[PDB]
Protein backbone atom coordinates (compact mmCIF):
# COMPACT_ATOMS: atom_id res chain seq x y z
CA UNK A 1 0.00 0.00 0.00
CA UNK A 2 1.15 3.53 -0.85
CA UNK A 3 0.60 6.54 1.41
CA UNK A 4 0.76 10.15 0.21
CA UNK A 5 1.73 13.48 1.73
CA UNK A 6 1.91 16.94 0.18
CA UNK A 7 2.91 20.52 0.98
CA UNK A 8 1.34 22.89 -1.54
CA UNK A 9 2.15 26.59 -1.95
CA UNK A 10 5.59 26.42 -0.34
CA UNK A 11 7.79 29.53 -0.33
CA UNK A 12 10.71 28.21 -2.37
CA UNK A 13 11.69 27.67 -5.99
CA UNK A 14 11.42 24.16 -7.38
CA UNK A 15 15.02 24.30 -8.61
CA UNK A 16 16.28 24.58 -5.03
CA UNK A 17 14.05 21.87 -3.54
CA UNK A 18 14.89 19.36 -6.28
CA UNK A 19 18.54 19.37 -5.18
CA UNK A 20 17.49 17.77 -1.88
CA UNK A 21 14.81 15.40 -3.18
CA UNK A 22 17.41 13.68 -5.37
CA UNK A 23 19.33 12.53 -2.27
CA UNK A 24 16.57 10.33 -0.80
CA UNK A 25 14.84 8.85 -3.86
CA UNK A 26 14.79 5.09 -3.39
CA UNK A 27 16.26 5.07 0.12
CA UNK A 28 14.92 3.67 3.38
CA UNK A 29 12.96 5.93 5.71
CA UNK A 30 15.43 5.53 8.58
CA UNK A 31 18.35 6.34 6.28
CA UNK A 32 16.57 9.31 4.71
CA UNK A 33 15.80 11.05 8.00
CA UNK A 34 19.48 10.96 8.94
CA UNK A 35 20.51 12.53 5.63
CA UNK A 36 18.12 15.48 5.89
CA UNK A 37 19.04 16.06 9.54
CA UNK A 38 22.66 16.84 8.61
CA UNK A 39 21.97 18.74 5.37
CA UNK A 40 22.57 22.49 5.67
CA UNK A 41 19.75 23.83 3.52
CA UNK A 42 16.36 25.40 4.12
CA UNK A 43 14.61 23.03 1.72
CA UNK A 44 15.74 20.10 3.88
CA UNK A 45 13.49 21.30 6.71
CA UNK A 46 10.34 21.39 4.57
CA UNK A 47 10.93 17.94 3.06
CA UNK A 48 11.51 16.40 6.49
CA UNK A 49 8.11 17.52 7.79
CA UNK A 50 6.41 16.08 4.70
CA UNK A 51 8.20 12.74 5.04
CA UNK A 52 7.27 12.48 8.73
CA UNK A 53 3.61 13.15 7.95
CA UNK A 54 3.44 10.31 5.41
CA UNK A 55 5.00 7.90 7.91
CA UNK A 56 2.35 8.76 10.49
CA UNK A 57 -0.49 8.44 7.97
CA UNK A 58 0.56 4.89 7.08
CA UNK A 59 0.49 3.71 10.70
CA UNK A 60 -2.75 5.41 11.74
CA UNK A 61 -4.75 4.93 8.53
CA UNK A 62 -3.07 2.10 6.59
CA UNK A 63 -1.72 0.22 9.62
CA UNK A 64 1.89 -0.29 8.54
CA UNK A 65 5.33 -0.49 10.16
CA UNK A 66 8.20 1.98 10.00
CA UNK A 67 11.05 -0.50 9.49
CA UNK A 68 9.54 -1.82 6.24
CA UNK A 69 8.80 1.54 4.58
CA UNK A 70 10.76 3.03 1.69
CA UNK A 71 10.66 6.19 -0.42
CA UNK A 72 9.36 4.97 -3.78
CA UNK A 73 8.37 8.26 -5.44
CA UNK A 74 9.16 11.92 -4.80
CA UNK A 75 8.92 14.96 -7.05
CA UNK A 76 8.52 18.74 -6.95
CA UNK A 77 6.24 20.77 -9.23
CA UNK A 78 5.96 24.50 -9.84
CA UNK A 79 3.32 26.59 -8.14
CA UNK A 80 1.81 30.04 -8.65
CA UNK A 81 4.15 33.01 -8.75
CA UNK A 82 3.56 36.31 -6.94
CA UNK A 83 4.25 39.54 -8.82
CA UNK A 84 6.08 42.46 -7.21
CA UNK A 85 7.65 45.74 -8.32
CA UNK A 86 11.26 46.85 -7.85
CA UNK A 87 12.30 50.45 -8.59
CA UNK A 88 15.48 51.00 -10.59
CA UNK A 89 17.38 54.09 -11.69
CA UNK A 90 16.03 56.80 -14.00
CA UNK A 91 12.37 56.05 -13.34
CA UNK A 92 12.58 52.53 -14.76
CA UNK A 93 10.79 49.71 -12.96
CA UNK A 94 11.41 45.96 -13.05
CA UNK A 95 9.23 43.01 -12.10
CA UNK A 96 10.02 40.50 -9.35
CA UNK A 97 8.75 36.91 -9.20
CA UNK A 98 8.45 35.12 -5.86
CA UNK A 99 8.15 31.49 -6.92
CA UNK A 100 6.46 28.67 -5.00
CA UNK A 101 6.48 24.88 -5.16
CA UNK A 102 4.33 21.80 -4.61
CA UNK A 103 6.08 18.96 -2.77
CA UNK A 104 4.89 15.35 -2.85
CA UNK A 105 6.20 12.20 -1.15
CA UNK A 106 5.11 8.57 -1.51
CA UNK A 107 6.07 5.74 0.87
CA UNK A 108 5.34 2.06 0.27
CA UNK A 109 5.70 -1.27 2.05
CA UNK A 110 7.41 -2.83 -0.98
Amino acid sequence: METIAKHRHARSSAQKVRLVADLIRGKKVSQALDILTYTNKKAAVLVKKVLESAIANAEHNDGADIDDLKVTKIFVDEGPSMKRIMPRAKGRADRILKRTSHITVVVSDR
Partner: peptide, 10 residues
Protein backbone atom coordinates in the same frame (compact mmCIF):
# COMPACT_ATOMS: atom_id res chain seq x y z
CA UNK B 1 28.07 19.68 -11.68
CA UNK B 2 25.49 21.33 -9.39
CA UNK B 3 24.43 18.15 -7.57
CA UNK B 4 24.89 17.80 -3.82
CA UNK B 5 26.70 15.15 -1.78
CA UNK B 6 25.28 13.28 1.19
CA UNK B 7 27.16 12.40 4.37
CA UNK B 8 29.02 9.11 4.00
CA UNK B 9 28.38 7.81 7.51
CA UNK B 10 27.66 8.99 11.05
Amino acid sequence: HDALTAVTSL
